[PDB]
Amino acid sequence: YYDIDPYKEFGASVELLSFLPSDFFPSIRDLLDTASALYREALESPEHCSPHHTALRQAILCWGELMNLATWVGSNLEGSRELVVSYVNVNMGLKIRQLLWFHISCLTFGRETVLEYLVSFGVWIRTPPAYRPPNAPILST
Amino acid sequence: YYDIDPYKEFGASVELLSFLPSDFFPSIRDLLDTASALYREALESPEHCSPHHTALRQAILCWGELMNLATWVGSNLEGSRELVVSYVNVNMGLKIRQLLWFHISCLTFGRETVLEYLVSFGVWIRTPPAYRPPNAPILST
Amino acid sequence: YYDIDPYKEFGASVELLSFLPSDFFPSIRDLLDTASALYREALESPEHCSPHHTALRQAILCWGELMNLATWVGSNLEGSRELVVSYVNVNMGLKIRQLLWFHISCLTFGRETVLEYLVSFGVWIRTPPAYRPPNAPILST
Amino acid sequence: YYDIDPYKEFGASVELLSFLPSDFFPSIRDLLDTASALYREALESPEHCSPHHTALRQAILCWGELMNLATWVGSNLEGSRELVVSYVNVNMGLKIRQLLWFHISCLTFGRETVLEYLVSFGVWIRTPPAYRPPNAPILST
Amino acid sequence: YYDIDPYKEFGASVELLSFLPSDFFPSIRDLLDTASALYREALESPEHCSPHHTALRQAILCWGELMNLATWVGSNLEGSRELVVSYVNVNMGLKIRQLLWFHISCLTFGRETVLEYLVSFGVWIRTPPAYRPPNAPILST
Amino acid sequence: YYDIDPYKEFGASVELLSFLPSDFFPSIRDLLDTASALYREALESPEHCSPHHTALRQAILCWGELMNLATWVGSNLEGSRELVVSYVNVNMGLKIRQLLWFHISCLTFGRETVLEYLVSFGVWIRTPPAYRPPNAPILST
């Protein structure tokens, strides 16, 4: 097929978010726990809200799809058990984490507030370490 | 946290869509060509619209990633090539078809109208063949 | 005191429903799945509504009690298992089907509309096959 | 299937009424005679009234169903005559009596009046006999 | 400079008309007789009208010139007579048919109406034959 | 038979307090000591409304009965002395700690203030150590 960028509607791009390093994003288990903690009720009583909830729902569904596929592959055929599990998360399991991180953070700290955090992280990481402050510009309210 | 239904915000459950038989849904290629045909420009110039476009975007992404994974499996290790592809479509590829079928049909023929087609198909299939109307369930403007 | 017809309050007699053939009515399983599908929540949060919900409730109870009785007969004494079950559905199980068929169809397609379907089916079946419209009695919104 | 409680709409529960002992309810013949005595006319000229009449109609119909079944069982096959008759009434013939007792009493003495009688019976039966009055709190206008 | 689509000014693309199969379009003779039948006078007394008449005029000219060229090829040099004529209709003669089919149908049944017929035919052809409505796509006033 | 949580009446769930690590909560003795220090006059003397006081009283009484049961068991029958007490604190002693911690913190800093502390601590632990604020969040005025 051809390209498509989910973040265009929200006000970013897939490569604007590419500045952040791979190891920066939290573990997927923690992201799911945070999503279930203070947003379990909102996802079960859907009124006309932001598409963030919908995106979270499809992300969770396409990820449970991956869990079912991995369990199947481990259960019938044939690195028979772990190679596919170790392969799915490295290349593409990062994609789900990026979606969850953006949508969860946008809901709590607000829509616009995340954007200046992103550009501030971009200038921080581009400058050589000899001239940048040793602490990253962590976000808050 | 694996009991989430997507369609509830739109007005339908998962068992409501279980009236339709499995093989009724069209092929993935035809749906993709249709979406690229009369809805390509909408996905590239996104304004504040219904979550249908977002659902289509994540569906296309969650399909393409599976395509790449199938290519990797067929070209890297080990039924090395044909077993995995024959399983994805029958097991999980059906889910992608249901999303595209619902969202595309809801966009063109409307949100309200596509609901009566579901119940009308339900009564059509349950009646015995001896009094079944001969081959006339269909959707039109 | 055994001459009581239920449907008179709704607008129909028992012989009026005798136009339809015996085998036209759908199976009990399909009716139960339909009722659980698009009417489960109504039976659990009862406000002042039409007696249709009450009729459905006593119909479901009068069916489940027969199920328990059949289980008892098949598992306790003595055609010990299959004779009694083969008789309940053909003799009295038909009555439960007629109640569910009328009330469910009356709820969705309306009270007034379901009456013309009865007379329309009556004229369709009485005409000779030589001029009968080929296989097109059906109900829709 | 699953549970359902007919009395929720009326304002009680199946287990609220479970406080009353099994031998408290009148004989079914007397209940039918009382129903036919001062309510034969109301059941043959149905205007938009309380669902009590409908519930009585379906109860009478599902009970005549049982009479027909018992006569059949006694007439063709095979405790061949009385075991089924003695079994239907003990476990489930009580259910019809509970329906008839509630609906008949609610019509005569009023809707709300039956409720305080029920709770007053509950406190009376729970207290040990050493401290409760020897006479039960019988109901009236 | 060879990427130009004609139908965009009217409201349709080229791939939108690719839903229809190749052999669905009528013959050239029937279209010519129809145009001469109910539209001869319009092409001879031209006022300020829609570009449909102009499109028809250049289509007829671009067909007649090919007819003259085929006559020349068959009567001058060299499959001297039948090879070239058998190729023009199958290769490029189809394009003339598409123009006449669209413009003639748009003139009689209207500009807006002929668009829904395109999407309606699209959904009709993509569905599997097992649930396809039996042979009923058609256009009428 | 009965499954109910004691937190929904205030504005928090039971899973919300489960997101924090178990070892975060202080020891059982310190919580009782501070409760006696700050609310001995409040617990003994009745005050209007203030459900926190009633919940605290109930928790203290239940803890006392549990301790009395432990003393009775440890010196009567049979790990006769240490197995059960080492099992009490781990199994339901943790819940007692959560009850005391929530209400005492709610009484001092207010009901609304303790809520953002829960989520702020929740996200802080989930974020990677290299990018989180160097100091842990603490509860204060």
Author numbering:
A (entry chain B), B (entry chain A), C (entry chain A), D (entry chain B), E (entry chain A), F (entry chain C): 49 to 126, 278 to 340
Paper lines:
The N-terminal domain of HBcAg (aa 1–149) can form a dimer and be assembled into a capsid with an icosahedral symmetry composed of 180 (T = 3 state) or 240 (T = 4 state) subunits. HAF is composed of HBcAg, along with histidine and tyrosine tags for binding to gold ions, as well as a tandem repeat of the affibody for binding to EGFR. In the HAF sequence, the affibody was inserted between α4 and α5 of the HBcAg, the spike tip of the HBcAg. The affibody used in this study specifically binds to the extracellular domain of EGFR with a dissociation constant (KD) of 5.4 nM.
HAF was expressed in E. coli and self-assembled into a spherical capsid form. A Fourier shell correlation (FSC) of 0.143 was chosen as the cutoff for resolution determination, and the final resolutions of HAF (T = 4 state) and HAF (T = 3 state) were 3.86 Å and 3.60 Å, respectively. The three subunits forming the asymmetric unit of HAF (T = 3 state) are colored in red, blue, and green. The density map of the affibody was not clearly visible since the connected linkers induced flexibility of the affibody, causing the structures of HAF to appear very similar to those of the HBcAg. Each linker composed of 10 or more residues made the affibody flexible, and thus the structure of the affibody in HAF could not be clearly confirmed even though the molecular structure of HAF was obtained. As a result, it was confirmed that HAF, in which the affibody was inserted by manipulating the spike tip, has a similar overall structure to that of HBcAg. The overall structure of HAF was not significantly different from that of HBcAg, except in having the affibody on the spike.
